[PDB]
Design a protein around this nucleic acid. Structure first.
Ligand SMILES: Nc1ncnc2c1ncn2[C@@H]1O[C@H](CSCC[C@H](N)C(=O)O)[C@@H](O)[C@H]1O
Ligand SMILES: [Cl-]
Ligand SMILES: [Mg+2]
Lengths: 217, 217
RNA sequence: GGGCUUCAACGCCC
């Protein structure tokens, strides 16, 4: 099963974009700004401390990359930071399991623009050019997940796609905010539950609906 | 939705047991032994790495308690540590989203043997006595989730349950090891995928199959 | 330089 990348704009797949991801570095030696560790610093910066939540992006990557859909080679993930940085994640990257270690890696990615293994010329993580729509499959239904939107059953929604049409889901990698982070890109907004879901739960729900629709065990 | 506890022996529900959980304490004040804080002193302190993955339990707790099946009131979670300590988790508990606060909570639970509601004397977390079977619904199918078992589709498995039959699933909240931590309790072992899964993904996959089966949206 | 790891990089250890 070939590793999926933005070069291939034909193969039917699921794509998840972790949008409004809170990934921003700051000097002291650089840290990845987070609400827990840098309350004081975020104060001086005149920032909403509540906004610094890189841990949400970390939790979603684990959920997505560990999923059967990813292991079956039918998943791509991108990260679109709240500051407009777009990142392509290699499906085979074994993301750090712990937050502190995820943090150091993100700092490096943001400063160097890619992450590589010493012997390889393949990028495990890469900063790429906006807009994401330039990189997605040509036939791709693009949706934003929103509690404000009509609720769907994921399998049923996916079954209604054309045979050659991918599905790209934009998930707000945040605790609180409006669903307008991808309004320029999406075809539709949908909700996955009568309950408000965390970003990670929304990711797993969409992955497991797609695994069902596509008969991935 | 009425809040499910082990006192209710009748109501049909899903139960998840996080087994072989890593919840070790370390003093200097007490903290949960982990890899981010303690990876450099483990050997020095005569401790195992296996003893320092409480992040796995943390991640599963969030995955489970944030799920629609929990919000619908049809889920219970228990934790059994690698030392045999058994814990009942109230469906309404808010697990802290940061590991730092999670540790404090867990340390207080292990030391006090319970955590009470901010509004009453009710215990939202409580250390209880083995075996887990004393606490499950009287009629309850019991299974261990394991890569090394025959793979099933969750929806079908759940739909085969009797109208009054609950389902309890045991998940290894650990980095690696034999999936034999519940052999004395279970009727059967089953796989959820042809790929190895994280404990968290095993959790969400079973939850989302149950949600589908029970028309929980 | 060498190691460790549900964590090539990161974070650590020697
Ligand atoms: N393919 C699969 N099907 C069902 N459960 C799985 C699974 N892969 C992993 N799990 C669950 O996730 C837990 C953590 S994976 C780590 C343990 C695993 N035995 C290794 O070695 C396992 O204990 C198992 O309960
Ligand atoms: Cl080491
Ligand atoms: Mg090294």
């Amino acid at each position: 099963p070939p590793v999926l990348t933005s070069k291939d704009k034909i193969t039917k797949r699921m794509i998840v974009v972790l949008a409004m991801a809170s990934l921003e570095t700051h000097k002291i030696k650089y840290v990845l700004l987070n609400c827990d560790d840098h309350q004081g610093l975020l104060k001086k910066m005149g920032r909403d401390i509540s906004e610094a939540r890189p841990d949400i992006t970390h939790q979603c990557l684990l959920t997505l990359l560990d999923s059967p859909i990813n292991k079956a080679g039918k998943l791509q993930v991108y990260i679109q930071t709240s500051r407009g940085i777009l990142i392509e994640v290699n499906p085979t990257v074994r993301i750090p399991r712990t937050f502190k270690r995820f943090s150091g890696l993100m700092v490096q990615l943001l400063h160097k623009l890619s992450i590589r293994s010493v012997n390889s010329e393949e990028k495990l993580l890469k900063v790429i050019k906006n807009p994401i729509t330039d990189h997605l499959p040509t036939k791709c239904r693009k949706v934003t997940l929103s509690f404000d939107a009509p609720v769907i059953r994921v399998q049923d929604y996916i079954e209604k796609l054309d045979d050659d049409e991918s599905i790209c889901v934009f998930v707000g990698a945040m605790a609180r905010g409006k669903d307008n982070f991808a309004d320029e890109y999406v075809d539709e907004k949908v909700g996955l539950s009568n309950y408000p879901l965390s970003a990670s739960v929304a990711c797993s729900k969409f992955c497991h609906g797609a695994e069902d629709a596509w008969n991935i065990l």
